[PDB]
Point group: D2
Chain length 249, copies 4
């Protein structure tokens, strides 16, 4: 079993890669910083179980992995963009097109690049990492919440055509997952150290804590194992019960 | 009260434009065919209570309506694109982009173009016509279902920020709505006439029939009326109960 | 067209009755207080357009209305119970059975009592008034949120069998609808006068205000008019955008 | 780690009990047939790693497990009732009550009976097995679909208060899961053997097959493991993609 995890330094990247690899997948990793050989080889050295790739674009990346490693069994599309908290009327149309490019077009392109090989052998798994923002409580996140919805609905829709070929498709919609040094989307500073951030979390999530990288990695790996292919199409709300609101004053 | 309905000859266009008009709104209309003065004039003669514009892109359409009728109270973004049933590996990436542009970037642009003047007047209603295909039963409809889902979520997201400025936002997600001569998406031929289509509609929908332009128009007109602003954010599933098994 | 509205003094009762009647329905009204003729006739006097009934139980009530007025076209099941904000382990099983009796069994019994006459003439509308609590943000409302869900799912399920008979079925799930002198569920004191209650509302709803009885009545009446039978099965979230949560600290 | 699985011979019972056991939980089992020492003993011989109880009602079942194995870490409320396809006007009101009691009051009672000891230990997992029939495509299933929806919402509601005490709550809503000899709800005869059933499953579900007890059991065991507590509140749609059109 060979896996691709994208943007491996951010968001759900490391949880996914590290846990897939503990389980025994062979894990090829994409990141933007891997443009640079200095960065690539420092990651390889830091994590000798993982296989970093330099390729950046979807068709590029799939083919390199296929040639180097024989075929792609598991695709984890771990998509990122910075959130821009503007009122609607202060965006340009181009800003949404960029957001949609990074969050919705991307996972479609990776799924387009890899499907035919997966269909041909009647096996594969496909996992999009999206966001609990999809139909959520926030305001002034309109470009971000909607693009994430497009992505979650894509996974569900793909699940229905790819069933005949024995290929499960899933979407994982997180909130409040600790991201360590990564700014996407809950870095340990400030979320783990600033007393207000710590309090906001305790207020508004049912479990009263951040979720861990391990919990997200454990999920990606459960879905990829083939123990429960029958859940195909599921959007998973990986949000620790967020939001909760307290009883009336 | 001034309204804009886009792509007026297709999908929920006529339903929406005609009902708004009966209700006393001044309804400006957009459509691709109004590029051609020829077609525009034919429309205006047939529909003296509607006012068809030639303008095609969102900002010029909004500016032109604003300048000739003096402020948009109501936007109905009636969005359409040719659905092509294909398996995921047979599409060009560029085909998804085109489909997202017509079904998803376009309602954003129209909202983006009208939002600041509605906030200033603290008054307005915004309606996206999307689709019941979002998270639906279909296969090989992946581009369409997902683009339409993006558009529905956009309506919900905007309702949340625009509430504060007294501006309700809605999506209407149809299936099986009669589109007359238009092929977007259930044209009278064949859906009303071919025995085998009539029976498919009768089997997989609860009311056992197609929805009408009057039903669609009546919903748009109620939403826009100011009578039930407190539904803001809602996705209405206009599908007569589809599917049934 | 003849309508029944239940518990007419509470919740969505008056909005429903008054607006149905403005539209030209003949409106028969049920309330618990109508047990007492003193209360009945004061309501009749106060509102001469409306027809109060004394009957309390579903079979009882339907038959009286049918005999007095010829047939029932529109059923508005406007169901109430006091919410009890306990932790789960502090309920008795009986407390949930009571809640389920008042919120879920009741609307089923009224729909059971009236269906056959509606099926026979191939016309009718059925409206349950439930609650946005159904899958909501609250805690320690567990008996209340779930019973309301049972009721909303009932409406949807009934819509699918009653389509062949041209009978639309809907569920209206409110939050924060001003209820005047009624304690179910947002009385004007304190919600309209106490500065904290007013503030909580501004914090957490998108429109930053209570919803009105008129807005709810306008909806029941729109659905009953037959202008848009094609929405059958809809659960309407009549909650003014609740909940919203502010940007990160 | 101690678990309880109810109605163990039906629906998701064996899936759940057997997988939990393989994972090192001590699994107590309940079932109507364990009224009769006869049947209980036959079960215990066949399944030496499972421990069947005779107790029938929620509080005695919980007390008896607590006293013989010393604290319930895991509740799996595997709920069942005979579905009778009838139109709304043909049911007795009392038939809805019975259906609500078995599918909805029962998981409440079991949760109600175990919650305080889990809060004290700040440790526990609670899983309801419900149904994909909630807001589904079926007609004349009104009592069943609604009772199951009540049960699913109960899981979500409890997750919200029990979070604070470190106790995750879940529902699993199945369709088309092989139930072996059990008639709740897809027995091997006929669903595995009759040509016409095999083809219906093949047509209306995306994976074109029935789910297995191993798949169900693997989900329960993952949820209960402590590995992904942050999903708490989730309704898992275990339906292989049903329906498709
Ligand atoms: C705008 C706040 O961010 C989120 O909603 C969640 C984020 O997208 C994913 C995580 N963790
Ligand atoms: C427990 C708080 O009450 C609600 O959720 C809304 C209420 O049930 C209906 C209204 N208005
Ligand atoms: Cl349509
Ligand atoms: Cl099942």
């Amino acid at each position: 079993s060979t896996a691709i995890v994208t943007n491996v330094k951010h968001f759900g990247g490391m949880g996914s890669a590290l846990r897939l690899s503990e389980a025994g997948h062979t894990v090829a990793c994409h990141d933007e910083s891997f443009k640079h050989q200095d960065e690539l080889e420092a990651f390889a050295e830091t994590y000798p179980q993982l296989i970093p790739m330099s390729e950046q674009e979807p068709v590029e990346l799939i083919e390199a992995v296929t040639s180097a490693l024989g075929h792609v069994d598991i695709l984890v599309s771990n998509d990122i963009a910075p959130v821009e908290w503007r009122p609607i009327d202060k965006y340009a149309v181009e800003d949404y097109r960029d957001m949609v490019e990074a969050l919705q077009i991307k996972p479609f392109a990776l799924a387009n690049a890899v499907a035919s090989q997966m269909k041909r052998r009647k096996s594969g798994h496909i996992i999009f990492i999206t966001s609990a923002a999809s139909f959520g409580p926030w305001k002034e996140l309109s470009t971000y919440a909607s693009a994430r919805a497009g992505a979650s609905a894509l996974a569900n829709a793909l699940s229905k055509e790819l069933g005949e070929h024995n290929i499960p498709v899933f979407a994982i919609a997180p909130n409040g997952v600790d991201s360590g040094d990564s700014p996407y989307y809950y870095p340990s500073e400030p979320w783990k150290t600033s007393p207000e951030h710590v309090a906001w979390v305790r207020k508004y999530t049912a479990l009263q804590r951040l979720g861990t990288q391990k919990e997200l990695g454990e999920l990606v790996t459960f879905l990829a194992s083939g123990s429960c292919d029958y859940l195909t199409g599921q959007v998973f709300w990986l949000a620790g019960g967020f939001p909760v609101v307290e009883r009336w004053p």
